Amino acid sequence: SFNQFVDYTLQDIICEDSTLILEQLAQISRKYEISFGKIYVTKPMVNESDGVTHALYPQEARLRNLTYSSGLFVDVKKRTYELKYELGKVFIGRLPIMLRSKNCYLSEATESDLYKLKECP
Amino acid sequence: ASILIGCRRAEVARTFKEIQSLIHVKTKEFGKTLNIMKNILRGKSQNLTYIPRFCSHLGLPMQVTTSAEYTAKKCKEIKEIAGKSPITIAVVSIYLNILLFQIPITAAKVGQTLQVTEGTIKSGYKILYEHRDKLVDP
Amino acid sequence: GYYELYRRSTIGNSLVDALDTLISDGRIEASLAMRVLETFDKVVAETLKDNTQSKLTVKGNLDTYGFCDDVWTFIVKNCQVTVESVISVDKLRIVACNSK
Amino acid sequence: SNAEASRVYEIIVESVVNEVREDFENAGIDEQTLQDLKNIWQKKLTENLMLCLYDKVTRTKARWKCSLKDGVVTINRNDYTFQKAQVEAEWV
Amino acid sequence: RITTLDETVGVTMSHTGMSMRSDNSNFLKVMPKKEILDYLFKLFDEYDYWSLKGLKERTRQPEAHLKECLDKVATLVKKGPYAFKYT
Amino acid sequence: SGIVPTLQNIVATVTLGCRLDLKTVALHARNAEYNPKRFAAVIMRIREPKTTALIFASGKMVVTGAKSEDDSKLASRKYARIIQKIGFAAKFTDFKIQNIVGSCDVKFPIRLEGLAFSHGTFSSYEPELFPGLIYRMVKPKIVLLIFVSGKIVLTGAKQREEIYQAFEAIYPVLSEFRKM
């Protein structure tokens, strides 16, 4: 239920209303259009208080009281219609990650690989 | 200005162009209004923090991160040429310590990164290659 | 548009003297030599803009700078005008108006 | 003395006579009077003043720099036609 | 499926907040008393019941001297159809 | 010490008390400049002394660009002479020093950071906007430009002693925050 929401549904929610315009009234009027192509996902990370945005592991996330979460990015497309004459990676929200999912690091781990990360198999 | 007050009072590292990348404050109006607010704070009674954010902007290891730290520390005590704004003095500490190793970045990519001048840092490289002696630690 | 500073040159005074000779001595009608000088400020304005390939370089001692009604006036003493030929002019009156 | 300016003066006389030929027929004086206008003007054709147009005049401390475009300068009884000029004079 | 951006993060993360790389886009960036009165009488001869908004545009000279002459030999009608129009 | 701050600029206003015609004056004068669409005033300059007159329409004129108190006074009488020479009844009136600018050097490197940390009530050191240091003095009212190399530019003075008294109270403070 988690992975099907990631791999498919996150494109379904965006692309179903991926366009929005603004009817500018002028006298010769104009139009402007902002659109979104594909939404892009990242790996779990923490932006610290100074500003370093590095890797993340849930053992430190359990002790530092944080959010085991990855950023999301959108390929945005801007347009302008002048009346229809036509003449970019934006962060949106750190989504919290379910453990042992495909986006998480610990899905790709052996027995001793968890043992070097202090995580029980 | 009070945003920059939160930069200094909470020990953060923000620049004027960083706020100018968000707001249109036209600089000369911005600094004098920042100046008179300081006198209000005076009437109501350190570039090292800026280093690892750019290292985070470049994605560099911690030993490489502290390599420019020992560079920027010893660059003040060595003197000669003085300040000339510490922003480019920070970025030539980056370019020296990346010339200590072999990371493929060069000056054109780091020029578009921190928004600077490639010709400026080679002039700072001229005094730095002479000063290559008093900067080694291990 | 079409300024009248070019009627004071060599060919600027030559066309006026050739038109006033026809009016005064002959029976040439009035208000017709004015249209020729209006054409004279139109053809030479397109001639010095297009059919000219010489560059000048003037360096001297400026004595008088005057600006009034978008007309710049200069008198440079002991100036060398470098064509493309260096001509040492002891005094060159420079009059210039707005080209826009 | 300039072969280009003598070519330039040939265009100026020819463009004047060919354009007021219509007005000489509208006024209706004579066609040969217009031909008398051409021959007298070429007969007259046979004090160091610069007449041009300024584009940019820059001045620093006491040094001047002027960007000049398109004019005709007659210096020492010699006709010159230019397209660009730069005047770097120095007022004491 | 959704692609994953797989680098050192902070290179991609630097373009989020402040980055000092502004704009890079073109999207939504936005007289004498007797002399001026002679031009005003010439302007009143063409259009008498006319507003002062286009009159300050059509003249574009000394607007304070234009406002003084507009109250001098002209009577600006307040409301009605000829609003802000001299008479 | 033995150092005297050399003056760089002395400004003085001169009110003639009259009213000229800017188009009539510029069509007959020589060394004068005037533009209505930029700044509606006549800019008069003379070769000796090399100064800058700012002839307004209401009889106002400021003379700047000299080095001594006499050179700003002598040129203003020359500036009053040409206006009487054209055909007007100008009068040499209202003489007052607007500012005296002076700069010097001390020939030792100055520790501007510890000075700004200590004299924070008067120092204003922003390292990425202005490469020098801005210091203001209470008594006398002098603003000072301080460089690391030793360039000490002074301003905000109507008298020559105010530049010199400001240097004397700060050069031991300059001698404290020194390097090599």
PDB file of N, CA, C and O in Angstrom, chain C residues 61-70 72, chain F residues 23 26-27 30-34 37 45 47:
ATOM      1  N   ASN C  61      43.734  70.505 -26.570  1.00  0.00           N
ATOM      2  CA  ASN C  61      43.448  71.236 -25.344  1.00  0.00           C
ATOM      3  C   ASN C  61      42.099  71.928 -25.498  1.00  0.00           C
ATOM      4  O   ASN C  61      41.942  72.807 -26.353  1.00  0.00           O
ATOM      5  N   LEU C  62      41.122  71.515 -24.691  1.00  0.00           N
ATOM      6  CA  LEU C  62      39.781  72.092 -24.763  1.00  0.00           C
ATOM      7  C   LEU C  62      39.771  73.428 -24.030  1.00  0.00           C
ATOM      8  O   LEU C  62      40.306  73.538 -22.924  1.00  0.00           O
ATOM      9  N   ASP C  63      39.175  74.449 -24.649  1.00  0.00           N
ATOM     10  CA  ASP C  63      39.136  75.783 -24.062  1.00  0.00           C
ATOM     11  C   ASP C  63      37.714  76.237 -23.746  1.00  0.00           C
ATOM     12  O   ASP C  63      37.506  77.002 -22.799  1.00  0.00           O
ATOM     13  N   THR C  64      36.726  75.759 -24.500  1.00  0.00           N
ATOM     14  CA  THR C  64      35.353  76.223 -24.365  1.00  0.00           C
ATOM     15  C   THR C  64      34.401  75.069 -24.657  1.00  0.00           C
ATOM     16  O   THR C  64      34.401  74.519 -25.761  1.00  0.00           O
ATOM     17  N   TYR C  65      33.609  74.691 -23.650  1.00  0.00           N
ATOM     18  CA  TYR C  65      32.530  73.732 -23.840  1.00  0.00           C
ATOM     19  C   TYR C  65      31.202  74.425 -23.588  1.00  0.00           C
ATOM     20  O   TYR C  65      31.002  75.081 -22.566  1.00  0.00           O
ATOM     21  N   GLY C  66      30.295  74.278 -24.536  1.00  0.00           N
ATOM     22  CA  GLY C  66      29.018  74.953 -24.423  1.00  0.00           C
ATOM     23  C   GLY C  66      27.889  74.015 -24.776  1.00  0.00           C
ATOM     24  O   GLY C  66      27.929  73.316 -25.796  1.00  0.00           O
ATOM     25  N   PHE C  67      26.865  74.016 -23.925  1.00  0.00           N
ATOM     26  CA  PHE C  67      25.698  73.186 -24.180  1.00  0.00           C
ATOM     27  C   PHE C  67      24.429  73.991 -23.953  1.00  0.00           C
ATOM     28  O   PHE C  67      24.183  74.474 -22.843  1.00  0.00           O
ATOM     29  N   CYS C  68      23.619  74.095 -25.007  1.00  0.00           N
ATOM     30  CA  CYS C  68      22.377  74.852 -24.963  1.00  0.00           C
ATOM     31  C   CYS C  68      21.421  74.302 -26.008  1.00  0.00           C
ATOM     32  O   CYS C  68      21.770  74.254 -27.191  1.00  0.00           O
ATOM     33  N   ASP C  69      20.233  73.885 -25.553  1.00  0.00           N
ATOM     34  CA  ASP C  69      19.123  73.413 -26.395  1.00  0.00           C
ATOM     35  C   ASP C  69      19.531  72.209 -27.239  1.00  0.00           C
ATOM     36  O   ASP C  69      19.368  72.195 -28.463  1.00  0.00           O
ATOM     37  N   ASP C  70      20.100  71.205 -26.555  1.00  0.00           N
ATOM     38  CA  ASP C  70      20.551  69.934 -27.138  1.00  0.00           C
ATOM     39  C   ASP C  70      21.607  70.137 -28.226  1.00  0.00           C
ATOM     40  O   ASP C  70      21.754  69.317 -29.135  1.00  0.00           O
ATOM     41  N   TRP C  72      25.629  70.716 -28.516  1.00  0.00           N
ATOM     42  CA  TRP C  72      26.939  70.744 -27.884  1.00  0.00           C
ATOM     43  C   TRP C  72      27.891  71.570 -28.733  1.00  0.00           C
ATOM     44  O   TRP C  72      27.913  71.438 -29.960  1.00  0.00           O
TER      45      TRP C  72
ATOM     46  N   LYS F  23      19.192  80.261 -20.213  1.00  0.00           N
ATOM     47  CA  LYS F  23      19.382  80.128 -21.654  1.00  0.00           C
ATOM     48  C   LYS F  23      20.107  81.338 -22.225  1.00  0.00           C
ATOM     49  O   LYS F  23      20.852  81.218 -23.205  1.00  0.00           O
ATOM     50  N   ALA F  26      23.966  80.853 -21.005  1.00  0.00           N
ATOM     51  CA  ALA F  26      24.688  79.790 -21.702  1.00  0.00           C
ATOM     52  C   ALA F  26      24.842  80.053 -23.197  1.00  0.00           C
ATOM     53  O   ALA F  26      25.690  79.423 -23.838  1.00  0.00           O
ATOM     54  N   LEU F  27      24.064  80.968 -23.767  1.00  0.00           N
ATOM     55  CA  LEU F  27      24.222  81.279 -25.182  1.00  0.00           C
ATOM     56  C   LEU F  27      25.295  82.337 -25.426  1.00  0.00           C
ATOM     57  O   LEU F  27      25.578  82.675 -26.580  1.00  0.00           O
ATOM     58  N   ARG F  30      31.257  81.082 -21.979  1.00  0.00           N
ATOM     59  CA  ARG F  30      32.198  80.168 -22.611  1.00  0.00           C
ATOM     60  C   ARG F  30      32.258  78.894 -21.802  1.00  0.00           C
ATOM     61  O   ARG F  30      31.658  77.880 -22.181  1.00  0.00           O
ATOM     62  N   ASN F  31      32.958  78.946 -20.672  1.00  0.00           N
ATOM     63  CA  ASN F  31      33.250  77.746 -19.890  1.00  0.00           C
ATOM     64  C   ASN F  31      32.095  77.480 -18.940  1.00  0.00           C
ATOM     65  O   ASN F  31      32.213  77.670 -17.725  1.00  0.00           O
ATOM     66  N   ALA F  32      30.979  77.015 -19.492  1.00  0.00           N
ATOM     67  CA  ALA F  32      29.804  76.766 -18.664  1.00  0.00           C
ATOM     68  C   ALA F  32      29.020  75.601 -19.247  1.00  0.00           C
ATOM     69  O   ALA F  32      29.024  75.382 -20.461  1.00  0.00           O
ATOM     70  N   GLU F  33      28.349  74.858 -18.371  1.00  0.00           N
ATOM     71  CA  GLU F  33      27.583  73.673 -18.752  1.00  0.00           C
ATOM     72  C   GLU F  33      26.194  73.704 -18.121  1.00  0.00           C
ATOM     73  O   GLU F  33      26.059  74.046 -16.946  1.00  0.00           O
ATOM     74  N   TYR F  34      25.166  73.303 -18.866  1.00  0.00           N
ATOM     75  CA  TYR F  34      23.808  73.364 -18.333  1.00  0.00           C
ATOM     76  C   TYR F  34      22.854  72.481 -19.112  1.00  0.00           C
ATOM     77  O   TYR F  34      22.794  72.555 -20.342  1.00  0.00           O
ATOM     78  N   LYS F  37      16.925  68.953 -18.541  1.00  0.00           N
ATOM     79  CA  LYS F  37      16.253  67.685 -18.284  1.00  0.00           C
ATOM     80  C   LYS F  37      16.968  66.843 -17.244  1.00  0.00           C
ATOM     81  O   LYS F  37      16.341  65.973 -16.631  1.00  0.00           O
ATOM     82  N   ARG F  45      33.042  76.225 -14.485  1.00  0.00           N
ATOM     83  CA  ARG F  45      34.372  75.817 -14.048  1.00  0.00           C
ATOM     84  C   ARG F  45      35.445  76.764 -14.590  1.00  0.00           C
ATOM     85  O   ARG F  45      35.376  77.241 -15.722  1.00  0.00           O
ATOM     86  N   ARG F  47      39.783  77.537 -14.855  1.00  0.00           N
ATOM     87  CA  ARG F  47      41.055  76.833 -14.899  1.00  0.00           C
ATOM     88  C   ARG F  47      41.886  77.093 -13.647  1.00  0.00           C
ATOM     89  O   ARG F  47      42.498  76.169 -13.106  1.00  0.00           O
TER      90      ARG F  47
END
